[PDB]
């Protein structure tokens, strides 16, 4: 279950086959990593957008607790935004869909 040494998930414009595992209690959605930074290295709003765009749920309606940080516009440096193929993200609460 070492989702790190892969780099072969869902490819996009800048994202080199990078998708994150968005889990919600049991529900899981595949969302592409936020680019416009450094391909494998996403932006600070990455973890925030990953869970948000995962099902179209506003940030204040969920609670992202993963990647060694919390949901926000900016928390921990990008270098700690899960330096891998998206990493894993989970939120506690509900989801607006």
């Amino acid at each position: 279950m070492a989702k790190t040494e892969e780099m072969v998930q869902t490819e996009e414009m800048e994202t080199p086959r990078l998708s994150v595992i968005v889990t919600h209690s049991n529900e899981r959605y595949d969302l592409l990593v936020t680019p416009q930074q450094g391909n494998s290295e996403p932006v600070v709003q990455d973890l925030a957008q990953l869970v948000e765009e995962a099902t179209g749920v506003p940030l204040p309606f969920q609670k992202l607790i993963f990647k060694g940080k919390s949901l926000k516009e900016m928390e921990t440096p990008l270098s700690a935004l899960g330096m891998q193929n998206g990493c894993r993200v989970m939120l506690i609460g509900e989801k607006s869909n």
Partner: peptide, 24 residues
């Protein structure tokens, strides 16, 4: 209810004695 998998299958439910579709 407009809640995909919340508490039960998807509706409000009256029994609510089986969290099989609580989130899964």
């Amino acid at each position: 209810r407009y809640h995909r998998r919340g508490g039960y299958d998807v509706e409000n439910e009256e029994k609510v004695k089986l969290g099989m579709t609580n989130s899964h």
